[PDB]
Amino acid sequence: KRLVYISKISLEEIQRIGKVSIKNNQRDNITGVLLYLQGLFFQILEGENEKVDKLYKKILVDDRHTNILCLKTEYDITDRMFPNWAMKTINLNENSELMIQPIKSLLQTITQSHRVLEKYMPARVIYLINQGINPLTVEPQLVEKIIFFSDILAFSTLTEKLPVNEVVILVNRYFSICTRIISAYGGEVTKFIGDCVMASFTKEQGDAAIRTSLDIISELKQLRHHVEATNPLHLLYTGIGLSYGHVIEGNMGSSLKMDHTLLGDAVNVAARLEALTRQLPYALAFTAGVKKCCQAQWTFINLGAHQVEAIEVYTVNEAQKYYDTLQITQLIRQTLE
Amino acid sequence: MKRLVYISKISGSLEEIQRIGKVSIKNNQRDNITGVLLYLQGLFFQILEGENEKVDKLYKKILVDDRHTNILCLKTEYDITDRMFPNWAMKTINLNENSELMIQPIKSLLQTITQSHRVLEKYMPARVIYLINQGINPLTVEPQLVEKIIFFSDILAFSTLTEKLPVNEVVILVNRYFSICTRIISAYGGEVTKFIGDCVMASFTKEQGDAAIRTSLDIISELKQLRHHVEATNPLHLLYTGIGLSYGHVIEGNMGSSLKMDHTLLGDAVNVAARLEALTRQLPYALAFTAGVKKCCQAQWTFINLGAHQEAIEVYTVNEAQKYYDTLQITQLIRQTLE
Ligand SMILES: Cc1cc2nc3c(=O)[nH]c(=O)nc-3n(C[C@H](O)[C@H](O)[C@H](O)COP(=O)(O)O)c2cc1C
Ligand SMILES: Cc1cc2nc3c(=O)[nH]c(=O)nc-3n(C[C@H](O)[C@H](O)[C@H](O)COP(=O)(O)O)c2cc1C
């Protein structure tokens, strides 16, 4: 198979890399080309399926380049594209031929624009692109997922009594903490909806979804006492709802607008449980489906049945609030006075 | 002293491309405009440069050109210090016919990254695409507090349809609903934020109050036409929508971290629009908005006061949003049909 990917750095060393790649690829019966431009690498590799994946994993863990994204993969090609170039290194910055400068300049402009759009893509779509799968042709599937929903407590009072610059810092830190912990436990963030964070886990990650929920609550608790009382981060609380059910995962829309979405009642149920945590002594609430997806010995606490066809609500004893929810909203209210 | 860079997609030969350059050389040289046009596998890559008044007017005529579509300006440089191609009125480079092997890697990379770019564009929020088309990097724009009309619309009894329809049919139904909503929202100047399940999130400025209501009624209208266009075995026959609108202060911008970025709207109006959207199940109207949206309307609509619901807010609607059916019996009609 042959693959195409772009990367990001972290000079005579890149010529040293080219010398190293020539010797290894010629030994490995693998050909291709490696380009460099303005701090970005462009490499094409081709060979037998088992051989190129062996090499692609070596460069994935390389310290020299970062932010790797496989753009394309063709598993059954008829003939190679560069049948004689073990690894042709092209330092395109050194090239000064004016006839290639337009193609050079357009390559840099689109690639830089491409690296920006990457940051807005859902993690599932980028994953599909890394696997050589076209997101516009892949059929959606019904999967058993654990839905994650979490937002900021008393966020209406915060937006009402905080400058625009302060709330942006507060939400960015909240999104950064949530995205980092969710991704660390193997979860996938779907999208941001206002101050809400939507994520999903597989049915094997039941305990990971609860550990993610507890780590997020714990990191916000650390952050609140890391800053001074004049810092908006001192008032950052969250509630977390989890649900389990059948959802349709895939890419929807038309040629004008596409999006990665999850279709199923478990999505709405997770949002209601997230809003239910305001009336509970616990900052985490999940259904029985999430509870039965857990193998670890959690101290499950039955919170009774609530209607959002009332459904059972559970939680863990570690999700207990050391504060009072209503007194915190009042504390948030009068602190901003 | 302006320079533009845009990519486009062809509409539908080789020798007809040489004419575009021939005309380009005649007009760009009389306009003192230089640039570079690249054609590669059904995509156009053109750089323009020159004075503002004549680059814009030239650029506006290339937009209405029938031969290329989906034009997106990627980069803009105002008050340039020096031209990039000072001698090329318009150098047309057909990369498809060039066969130099030393540029085939660069030619192959540019094609792959651009095709991947066109795919990512479709997933982007409309505001981000708008910012790129103005030459403004979205990751450098600071979030602003603006008064906007928030748009929410989802599918009626969507939980019953997901429980009683095959996956391929649910996808066909949702794709069509998203295709109709996006087209009507965009035609009225609205910006689609994202899709949340079966919900469509959009925003309008405070000067587009009437356009937000005309969008809502046009969506409801096209769903009615579509229902009797198809047969009773088609899932589109059971497609209904409720629409909620809200007006308030929202913080709009690019938020997140290096791991994840998203275009989001922060404000109570976003949550208000979602509840009014879900309020349409208990109303004989498929559209519900607040008094703030009502005050943004200049057209002489027949507003109907639906009382106060929930910190309570007062809900309004228009007479045209009236349903010819009953919402409860439709929920049961949808369920009895899927047997
Ligand atoms: C951008 C980039 C591209 C690389 N491409 C190759 C390659 O094509 N083939 C190869 O053997 N090594 C390539 N390398 C080097 C690998 O990271 C790897 O460290 C090296 O091949 C073997 O290292 P080792 O001998 O210490 O095990 C590349 C490194 C970078 C940063
Ligand atoms: C991709 C593309 C690029 C074009 N670039 C130019 C250009 O740079 N200059 C120009 O005068 N016309 C350009 N045209 C053609 C114009 O749209 C149009 O034919 C011309 O400006 C007006 O010609 P007319 O007055 O004879 O109708 C381009 C057309 C296409 C499809």
XYZ file of C-alpha atoms and ligand atoms in Angstrom:
738
model
C 0.000 0.000 0.000
C 0.985 3.665 -0.322
C 0.144 6.505 2.055
C 0.422 10.294 2.177
C 0.778 12.307 5.375
C 1.795 15.742 6.643
C 3.603 16.534 9.894
C 4.927 19.440 11.971
C 8.419 20.006 13.361
C 9.119 20.172 17.095
C 18.549 21.713 8.892
C 21.617 19.601 8.184
C 19.757 17.157 10.426
C 16.961 16.894 7.849
C 19.614 15.970 5.291
C 20.839 13.459 7.861
C 17.278 12.119 8.049
C 17.261 11.854 4.266
C 20.525 9.913 4.322
C 19.131 7.588 6.997
C 15.867 7.048 5.117
C 17.639 6.174 1.850
C 19.638 3.347 3.430
C 16.684 1.909 5.355
C 14.052 2.156 2.612
C 16.310 0.701 -0.090
C 16.827 -2.226 2.285
C 13.074 -2.423 2.967
C 12.005 -2.453 -0.725
C 9.993 0.709 0.031
C 10.056 3.789 -2.203
C 8.648 7.296 -2.068
C 9.494 10.957 -1.574
C 9.875 13.314 1.399
C 9.311 17.065 1.090
C 9.908 19.880 3.571
C 8.352 23.336 3.433
C 8.193 26.086 6.075
C 8.358 23.660 8.992
C 6.029 21.011 7.532
C 6.929 17.592 6.145
C 5.304 15.900 3.147
C 6.159 12.221 2.737
C 4.880 9.473 0.446
C 5.724 5.840 1.225
C 4.855 2.755 -0.808
C 5.510 -0.961 -0.496
C 4.022 -4.164 0.839
C 1.247 -3.701 3.388
C 3.092 -5.292 6.315
C 6.327 -3.468 5.454
C 5.122 0.139 5.274
C 3.035 -0.095 8.454
C 6.189 -1.340 10.168
C 7.943 1.864 9.087
C 5.001 4.220 9.644
C 4.885 3.297 13.339
C 8.589 4.123 13.702
C 8.125 7.685 12.441
C 4.901 8.101 14.453
C 6.873 8.000 17.722
C 9.624 10.227 16.378
C 10.449 13.264 18.498
C 11.488 15.394 15.525
C 8.011 15.749 13.984
C 4.600 16.198 15.605
C 0.909 16.552 14.730
C 0.947 13.633 12.302
C -2.056 13.120 10.012
C -2.291 10.416 7.352
C -4.189 11.989 4.459
C -4.711 9.061 2.074
C -4.134 5.315 1.726
C -4.616 2.979 -1.248
C -4.504 -0.689 -0.336
C -4.491 -2.359 -3.792
C -2.494 -0.268 -6.266
C -1.548 -1.602 -9.689
C 1.886 0.035 -9.988
C 4.105 2.289 -7.907
C 4.332 6.046 -8.401
C 8.098 6.429 -7.772
C 9.506 2.984 -8.650
C 13.169 4.039 -8.324
C 13.285 6.584 -5.461
C 14.033 4.864 -2.152
C 13.660 8.247 -0.434
C 14.105 11.407 -2.509
C 14.468 14.276 -0.036
C 13.354 17.673 -1.365
C 14.165 20.766 0.710
C 11.679 22.928 -1.160
C 12.725 26.047 0.778
C 16.139 25.973 -0.933
C 14.476 25.803 -4.363
C 14.509 29.219 -6.041
C 13.201 28.342 -9.525
C 10.491 30.925 -10.153
C 8.404 28.489 -12.218
C 7.820 26.213 -9.207
C 7.235 29.138 -6.825
C 3.505 29.459 -7.721
C 2.957 25.750 -7.092
C 5.176 26.153 -4.021
C 3.184 29.131 -2.738
C -0.173 27.454 -3.360
C 1.025 24.274 -1.643
C 2.020 26.290 1.435
C -1.190 28.349 1.522
C -3.553 25.377 1.249
C -1.542 23.194 3.642
C -1.516 25.957 6.265
C -5.240 26.472 5.707
C -5.640 22.689 5.936
C -3.819 22.545 9.285
C -6.273 25.123 10.662
C -9.396 23.240 9.579
C -7.935 20.125 11.199
C -8.351 21.731 14.618
C -12.128 22.090 14.100
C -12.657 18.518 12.868
C -14.327 15.973 15.173
C -11.847 13.429 16.469
C -13.779 10.606 14.793
C -13.438 12.125 11.314
C -9.698 12.759 11.712
C -9.390 9.150 12.881
C -11.167 7.971 9.722
C -8.852 10.076 7.547
C -5.805 8.613 9.308
C -7.121 5.125 8.480
C -7.408 5.995 4.781
C -11.223 6.112 4.813
C -13.174 8.808 2.981
C -15.561 10.436 5.503
C -18.034 11.362 2.740
C -18.577 7.771 1.533
C -18.452 5.756 4.774
C -21.904 4.530 5.777
C -23.123 5.384 9.293
C -23.542 2.517 11.740
C -25.636 1.822 14.819
C -23.258 1.323 17.749
C -23.590 0.888 21.507
C -22.010 4.033 22.953
C -21.668 5.706 26.341
C -22.651 9.359 25.913
C -20.838 12.051 27.905
C -22.331 15.469 28.670
C -20.904 18.145 30.961
C -21.220 21.922 31.245
C -20.398 24.735 33.663
C -22.532 25.223 36.771
C -24.453 28.515 36.988
C -23.035 29.520 33.605
C -25.876 32.021 33.146
C -24.757 33.995 36.207
C -21.153 33.930 34.966
C -21.949 35.328 31.511
C -24.218 37.918 33.135
C -21.534 39.294 35.481
C -18.194 38.743 33.717
C -16.360 40.562 30.910
C -16.163 38.819 27.548
C -12.415 38.277 27.934
C -12.832 36.565 31.317
C -15.506 34.070 30.241
C -13.477 33.138 27.147
C -10.484 32.297 29.350
C -12.754 30.365 31.721
C -14.429 28.267 29.022
C -11.213 27.619 27.077
C -9.589 26.231 30.224
C -12.724 24.172 30.881
C -12.726 22.854 27.307
C -8.983 22.170 27.524
C -9.253 20.204 30.778
C -12.243 18.205 29.518
C -10.738 17.445 26.103
C -7.402 16.380 27.606
C -8.923 14.012 30.174
C -11.494 12.561 27.755
C -8.827 11.897 25.122
C -6.449 10.403 27.699
C -8.998 7.715 28.642
C -9.647 6.799 25.002
C -12.799 8.884 24.653
C -13.808 10.994 21.668
C -15.099 14.551 21.941
C -17.970 15.059 19.497
C -18.481 18.842 19.635
C -18.944 21.838 21.915
C -22.494 23.141 22.408
C -22.392 26.417 24.295
C -20.633 25.629 27.557
C -21.513 21.935 27.169
C -19.009 19.226 26.231
C -20.333 16.195 24.345
C -18.211 13.044 24.204
C -18.638 9.322 23.627
C -17.047 6.094 24.842
C -17.350 2.526 23.621
C -19.214 -0.093 25.636
C -15.871 -1.471 26.888
C -14.925 1.918 28.414
C -17.567 2.055 31.143
C -15.079 2.540 33.969
C -13.010 4.918 31.828
C -16.041 7.180 31.385
C -16.503 7.367 35.159
C -12.776 7.875 35.770
C -12.898 10.662 33.179
C -15.853 12.242 34.982
C -14.109 12.033 38.362
C -10.801 13.353 36.995
C -12.523 16.363 35.405
C -14.303 17.185 38.668
C -11.037 16.687 40.556
C -8.969 18.898 38.243
C -11.518 21.711 38.491
C -11.333 21.374 42.279
C -7.544 21.709 42.124
C -7.801 24.688 39.763
C -10.215 26.599 42.007
C -7.675 26.710 44.854
C -4.688 27.244 42.534
C -5.820 30.782 41.639
C -6.880 33.838 43.613
C -10.460 34.875 44.348
C -10.254 37.618 41.700
C -9.657 34.963 39.006
C -12.823 33.680 37.269
C -11.404 30.134 37.377
C -12.081 30.264 41.143
C -15.799 29.785 40.349
C -15.568 26.912 37.836
C -17.825 23.954 38.673
C -19.289 21.232 36.475
C -22.019 18.633 36.360
C -21.624 15.428 34.375
C -24.266 13.109 32.943
C -23.649 9.714 31.353
C -25.972 7.495 29.333
C -25.743 4.198 27.461
C -27.806 3.151 24.463
C -27.944 2.533 20.741
C -26.852 5.522 18.655
C -26.312 6.027 14.926
C -22.761 7.298 14.403
C -21.732 8.731 11.058
C -21.343 11.765 8.829
C -24.573 13.569 7.911
C -25.560 16.619 5.872
C -25.180 17.612 2.234
C -22.583 19.160 -0.069
C -23.152 22.559 1.562
C -22.680 21.454 5.179
C -21.499 18.214 6.764
C -21.107 17.193 10.401
C -20.297 14.161 12.546
C -23.354 13.410 14.654
C -24.856 10.818 16.984
C -28.526 9.906 16.516
C -30.234 8.282 19.489
C -32.252 8.824 22.660
C -29.158 8.200 24.806
C -27.872 11.614 23.693
C -30.832 13.512 25.145
C -30.941 11.343 28.283
C -27.299 12.158 29.039
C -28.050 15.886 28.793
C -30.993 15.671 31.206
C -28.933 13.737 33.767
C -26.258 16.421 33.483
C -28.865 19.057 34.347
C -30.228 16.824 37.129
C -26.933 17.049 39.049
C -27.921 20.567 40.169
C -30.612 19.066 42.427
C -28.324 16.299 43.745
C -25.536 16.070 46.340
C -23.453 14.476 43.531
C -21.855 16.045 40.479
C -22.134 12.840 38.396
C -25.262 10.953 37.322
C -25.638 8.001 34.954
C -28.200 5.373 33.988
C -28.284 1.653 34.736
C -26.779 0.942 31.315
C -23.619 2.822 32.275
C -23.637 1.085 35.664
C -23.745 -2.386 34.096
C -20.923 -1.454 31.690
C -18.546 -1.105 34.667
C -16.286 -3.928 35.858
C -14.401 -2.136 38.641
C -15.703 -2.173 42.215
C -17.476 1.178 42.380
C -19.562 2.205 45.387
C -22.723 2.710 43.358
C -25.393 4.906 44.954
C -28.961 4.510 43.711
C -30.458 7.985 43.245
C -33.940 6.726 42.373
C -36.015 7.113 39.233
C -36.418 10.473 37.493
C -38.404 11.277 34.353
C -36.877 13.064 31.367
C -41.062 6.829 31.155
C -38.966 7.522 34.247
C -35.516 5.920 34.247
C -33.188 4.850 37.042
C -30.310 7.140 38.043
C -27.068 6.005 39.684
C -23.830 7.617 40.836
C -20.611 6.828 42.702
C -19.817 7.842 46.270
C -16.632 9.563 45.093
C -18.770 12.031 43.104
C -20.080 13.526 46.359
C -19.948 17.311 46.626
C -18.167 18.800 49.625
C -20.304 21.918 49.026
C -23.994 22.757 48.690
C -25.143 23.332 45.115
C -27.660 26.080 45.900
C -25.246 27.859 48.246
C -22.600 27.768 45.504
C -24.890 29.447 42.968
C -25.591 32.091 45.612
C -21.859 32.238 46.357
C -21.177 32.717 42.639
C -23.947 35.328 42.498
C -22.775 37.605 45.317
C -19.043 37.133 44.692
C -19.655 38.953 41.389
C -20.999 41.984 43.286
C -2.523 47.152 -3.649
C -4.440 43.917 -3.095
C -3.636 40.226 -3.517
C -6.144 37.362 -3.460
C -5.805 33.571 -3.479
C -8.826 31.365 -4.176
C -9.559 27.765 -5.142
C -12.611 26.617 -7.085
C -14.252 23.563 -8.644
C -15.058 23.238 -12.341
C -18.676 22.876 -13.402
C -18.259 20.418 -16.287
C -12.765 20.865 -21.556
C -9.047 21.164 -22.304
C -9.230 23.597 -25.225
C -11.922 25.688 -23.528
C -9.399 26.493 -20.777
C -6.964 28.244 -23.141
C -9.706 30.759 -23.961
C -10.069 31.785 -20.310
C -6.381 32.655 -20.181
C -6.512 34.452 -23.531
C -9.295 36.711 -22.249
C -7.548 36.990 -18.877
C -4.342 38.285 -20.484
C -6.258 40.962 -22.400
C -8.251 42.264 -19.429
C -5.636 41.864 -16.685
C -2.969 43.673 -18.711
C -5.290 46.608 -19.426
C -6.308 46.578 -15.742
C -2.609 46.508 -14.723
C -3.497 43.310 -12.834
C -1.083 40.380 -12.653
C -1.560 36.867 -11.354
C -1.270 33.123 -11.876
C -3.977 30.593 -12.790
C -3.498 26.854 -12.214
C -5.774 24.044 -13.401
C -5.379 20.564 -11.916
C -7.892 17.690 -12.052
C -11.082 19.738 -12.147
C -9.881 22.396 -9.685
C -8.765 25.975 -10.346
C -5.957 27.698 -8.429
C -5.736 31.424 -9.163
C -3.736 34.204 -7.507
C -4.675 37.815 -8.241
C -2.877 41.042 -7.398
C -3.418 44.716 -8.122
C -5.321 47.766 -6.970
C -8.310 47.262 -4.688
C -11.035 48.842 -6.831
C -10.089 46.790 -9.904
C -9.162 43.507 -8.195
C -12.520 43.378 -6.397
C -14.599 44.233 -9.478
C -12.645 41.609 -11.420
C -13.104 39.094 -8.597
C -16.864 39.696 -8.447
C -17.223 38.759 -12.124
C -15.313 35.494 -11.669
C -17.812 34.525 -8.954
C -20.800 34.706 -11.330
C -18.896 32.668 -13.927
C -20.943 29.659 -15.047
C -17.874 27.463 -15.627
C -16.646 27.056 -12.029
C -18.442 26.631 -8.709
C -17.751 26.497 -4.961
C -15.275 29.379 -5.004
C -13.429 29.889 -1.706
C -10.874 32.645 -1.134
C -8.217 31.269 1.201
C -5.882 34.243 1.701
C -5.961 38.027 1.295
C -3.140 40.571 1.580
C -4.090 44.250 1.715
C -1.574 46.995 0.919
C 1.032 44.617 -0.467
C 4.654 45.747 -0.412
C 5.561 44.102 -3.729
C 3.885 41.943 -6.348
C 4.530 38.208 -6.529
C 4.382 37.952 -10.352
C 5.108 41.452 -11.686
C 5.386 40.371 -15.345
C 2.584 37.785 -15.682
C -0.735 39.378 -16.637
C -2.147 35.864 -16.245
C 0.092 32.811 -16.606
C -2.110 29.756 -17.160
C -0.457 26.503 -16.049
C -2.262 23.263 -16.950
C -0.613 20.837 -14.532
C -2.608 17.923 -15.971
C -0.819 18.156 -19.327
C 2.631 18.730 -17.814
C 4.495 15.435 -17.440
C 7.802 16.485 -15.852
C 8.561 13.719 -13.365
C 10.471 16.035 -11.013
C 7.250 17.948 -10.234
C 4.891 14.949 -10.115
C 5.387 14.613 -6.315
C 4.588 18.310 -5.831
C 1.749 17.916 -8.337
C 0.440 14.825 -6.531
C 0.730 16.420 -3.082
C -1.085 19.609 -4.117
C -3.946 17.511 -5.501
C -4.279 15.353 -2.378
C -4.057 18.203 0.139
C -6.575 20.271 -1.836
C -9.092 17.436 -2.188
C -8.717 16.814 1.545
C -9.159 20.554 2.081
C -12.423 20.597 0.114
C -13.683 17.743 2.306
C -12.828 19.566 5.540
C -14.579 22.728 4.315
C -17.927 20.923 4.377
C -17.522 20.143 8.094
C -16.584 23.716 9.043
C -19.062 26.130 10.637
C -20.306 28.763 8.214
C -18.735 31.569 10.260
C -15.272 30.023 9.942
C -15.690 29.686 6.169
C -16.833 33.315 6.099
C -13.741 34.457 8.009
C -11.398 32.576 5.667
C -13.133 34.074 2.623
C -12.334 37.532 4.043
C -8.657 36.657 4.506
C -8.889 36.524 8.314
C -7.329 33.572 10.122
C -10.066 32.169 12.405
C -7.582 31.121 15.108
C -6.507 34.772 15.531
C -9.997 36.297 15.838
C -10.936 37.298 19.370
C -14.460 36.323 20.481
C -17.001 39.145 20.491
C -20.277 39.734 22.308
C -23.034 40.252 19.733
C -26.824 40.330 19.649
C -27.962 37.383 17.540
C -31.085 35.372 16.805
C -30.496 31.716 17.684
C -32.120 29.050 15.499
C -32.918 25.506 16.642
C -34.925 22.908 14.723
C -35.157 19.123 15.061
C -37.334 16.252 13.851
C -40.690 15.563 15.494
C -40.950 12.170 17.233
C -37.374 11.418 16.167
C -37.000 8.923 19.028
C -39.863 6.831 17.637
C -38.359 6.907 14.140
C -34.914 5.835 15.367
C -36.527 2.969 17.303
C -38.684 1.788 14.375
C -36.649 2.557 11.246
C -33.569 0.820 9.809
C -30.284 2.695 10.047
C -30.047 3.307 6.295
C -33.525 4.881 6.313
C -32.754 7.119 9.307
C -29.631 8.384 7.533
C -31.600 9.122 4.351
C -34.242 10.979 6.371
C -31.707 12.996 8.376
C -29.538 13.842 5.355
C -32.572 15.223 3.518
C -33.720 17.232 6.545
C -30.224 18.663 7.014
C -29.992 19.389 3.280
C -33.263 21.343 3.278
C -32.505 23.268 6.478
C -28.971 24.198 5.404
C -30.045 25.388 1.944
C -32.895 27.553 3.261
C -30.865 28.970 6.163
C -27.955 29.862 3.877
C -30.204 31.420 1.222
C -31.601 33.867 3.805
C -28.147 34.897 5.040
C -28.136 32.660 8.106
C -25.131 30.692 9.336
C -25.456 27.047 10.357
C -23.417 26.482 13.509
C -23.477 22.681 13.817
C -25.710 19.611 13.983
C -26.601 18.141 17.395
C -28.330 14.824 16.884
C -31.345 15.704 14.749
C -31.123 19.368 15.819
C -29.950 22.103 13.449
C -28.253 25.049 15.164
C -28.121 28.330 13.247
C -27.748 32.029 13.985
C -28.990 35.282 12.472
C -28.021 38.883 13.094
C -30.439 41.314 14.719
C -31.140 42.839 11.279
C -32.364 39.438 9.999
C -35.417 39.049 12.229
C -37.826 38.671 9.321
C -35.356 36.421 7.492
C -35.229 34.093 10.507
C -39.021 33.729 10.438
C -39.121 33.380 6.648
C -36.487 30.655 7.010
C -38.565 28.817 9.619
C -41.759 28.904 7.552
C -39.931 27.882 4.365
C -38.441 24.851 6.127
C -41.873 23.843 7.436
C -43.319 24.455 3.969
C -40.766 22.356 2.077
C -41.215 19.485 4.534
C -44.956 19.567 3.822
C -44.369 19.471 0.060
C -41.836 16.653 0.461
C -44.260 14.576 2.546
C -46.845 14.266 -0.233
C -44.169 14.118 -2.960
C -43.080 10.603 -1.942
C -45.001 7.408 -1.175
C -46.078 6.138 2.240
C -43.228 3.588 2.237
C -40.648 6.403 2.069
C -39.480 7.640 5.504
C -39.649 11.227 4.190
C -43.447 10.854 4.378
C -43.203 11.109 8.197
C -40.828 14.097 8.457
C -41.989 16.988 10.653
C -40.089 19.714 12.478
C -40.404 22.132 15.354
C -38.498 25.410 15.324
C -37.503 27.665 18.214
C -35.986 31.136 17.930
C -34.427 33.316 20.619
C -32.816 36.754 20.729
C -30.148 37.691 23.240
C -26.518 38.480 23.911
C -24.184 35.670 22.862
C -20.404 35.357 22.827
C -19.301 34.131 19.401
C -15.799 32.939 18.598
C -13.311 30.110 18.305
C -12.882 28.250 21.589
C -11.103 25.193 22.958
C -7.412 24.270 22.888
C -4.813 22.796 20.536
C -6.402 19.360 21.031
C -9.884 20.503 19.956
C -11.245 23.725 18.471
C -14.881 24.618 17.837
C -16.995 27.608 16.809
C -19.440 28.093 19.658
C -22.019 30.563 20.943
C -22.193 31.336 24.672
C -25.458 32.716 26.005
C -28.801 32.005 27.628
C -30.484 32.656 24.269
C -28.943 29.420 22.969
C -30.578 27.451 25.781
C -33.794 29.479 25.435
C -34.099 28.659 21.726
C -33.755 24.934 22.460
C -36.566 24.908 25.033
C -38.939 26.883 22.800
C -38.076 24.417 20.044
C -39.105 21.578 22.374
C -42.149 23.626 23.429
C -43.654 23.308 19.930
C -44.757 19.743 20.763
C -47.443 21.118 23.107
C -48.493 23.963 20.786
C -50.705 24.121 17.672
C -47.820 25.997 16.037
C -44.519 24.614 14.746
C -42.620 27.866 15.431
C -42.058 29.523 18.812
C -39.899 32.576 19.517
C -39.361 35.130 22.276
C -40.356 38.796 22.355
C -36.791 39.749 21.440
C -37.197 38.037 18.073
C -40.613 39.686 17.717
C -39.041 43.122 18.232
C -36.428 42.435 15.521
C -39.149 42.057 12.865
C -39.996 44.878 10.466
C -42.540 42.964 8.375
C -46.200 43.096 9.397
C -46.575 39.591 10.767
C -49.652 38.535 12.741
C -48.000 37.749 16.062
C -49.816 35.401 18.449
C -49.009 35.642 22.163
C -48.582 32.106 23.526
C -48.281 33.243 27.146
C -45.376 32.840 29.541
C -43.562 29.517 29.957
C -40.368 28.171 31.497
C -37.522 32.995 35.322
C -40.451 32.723 32.924
C -40.275 34.143 29.399
C -43.102 35.202 27.096
C -43.475 33.162 23.901
C -44.800 34.392 20.554
C -45.522 32.917 17.133
C -47.066 33.837 13.785
C -50.411 32.831 12.310
C -48.758 31.146 9.327
C -46.922 28.750 11.683
C -50.309 27.124 12.383
C -50.437 23.341 12.020
C -53.058 21.699 9.826
C -52.729 18.569 12.009
C -52.684 17.639 15.694
C -49.261 17.050 17.227
C -50.331 14.209 19.536
C -52.224 12.299 16.841
C -49.251 12.722 14.494
C -46.969 11.158 17.115
C -49.388 8.224 17.222
C -49.844 8.305 13.436
C -46.072 7.993 13.021
C -46.053 5.065 15.453
C -49.038 3.219 13.963
C -47.553 3.600 10.474
C -44.287 1.880 11.483
C -45.844 -1.542 12.000
C 9.598 13.464 8.817
C 10.375 12.195 9.003
C 10.320 11.214 8.024
C 11.034 10.036 8.183
N 10.967 9.076 7.200
C 11.667 7.902 7.339
C 11.597 6.933 6.346
O 10.912 7.122 5.341
N 12.300 5.756 6.487
C 13.068 5.548 7.614
O 13.696 4.500 7.748
N 13.138 6.508 8.601
C 12.440 7.689 8.474
N 12.514 8.648 9.468
C 13.356 8.395 10.690
C 12.542 7.564 11.683
O 11.966 8.434 12.633
C 13.344 6.489 12.425
O 13.845 7.016 13.636
C 14.491 5.884 11.617
O 14.030 5.410 10.373
C 15.099 4.701 12.361
O 15.581 5.094 13.628
P 16.456 4.064 14.505
O 17.582 3.564 13.632
O 17.029 4.778 15.708
O 15.593 2.906 14.954
C 11.808 9.830 9.323
C 11.861 10.815 10.305
C 11.144 11.998 10.144
C 11.200 13.061 11.202
C -11.252 30.224 -13.071
C -11.464 31.479 -13.863
C -10.549 32.516 -13.753
C -10.737 33.681 -14.482
N -9.822 34.703 -14.364
C -9.998 35.862 -15.082
C -9.074 36.891 -14.963
O -8.102 36.764 -14.217
N -9.249 38.054 -15.682
C -10.341 38.188 -16.515
O -10.506 39.219 -17.159
N -11.256 37.168 -16.636
C -11.096 36.002 -15.922
N -12.020 34.981 -16.041
C -13.206 35.128 -16.956
C -14.220 36.141 -16.428
O -15.151 35.502 -15.584
C -14.963 36.811 -17.579
O -14.954 35.952 -18.696
C -14.314 38.138 -17.964
O -13.814 38.781 -16.813
C -15.312 39.058 -18.656
O -15.399 38.746 -20.030
P -16.517 39.443 -20.956
O -16.524 40.923 -20.653
O -16.170 39.230 -22.411
O -17.873 38.847 -20.660
C -11.838 33.815 -15.322
C -12.755 32.777 -15.430
C -12.567 31.608 -14.701
C -13.557 30.486 -14.818
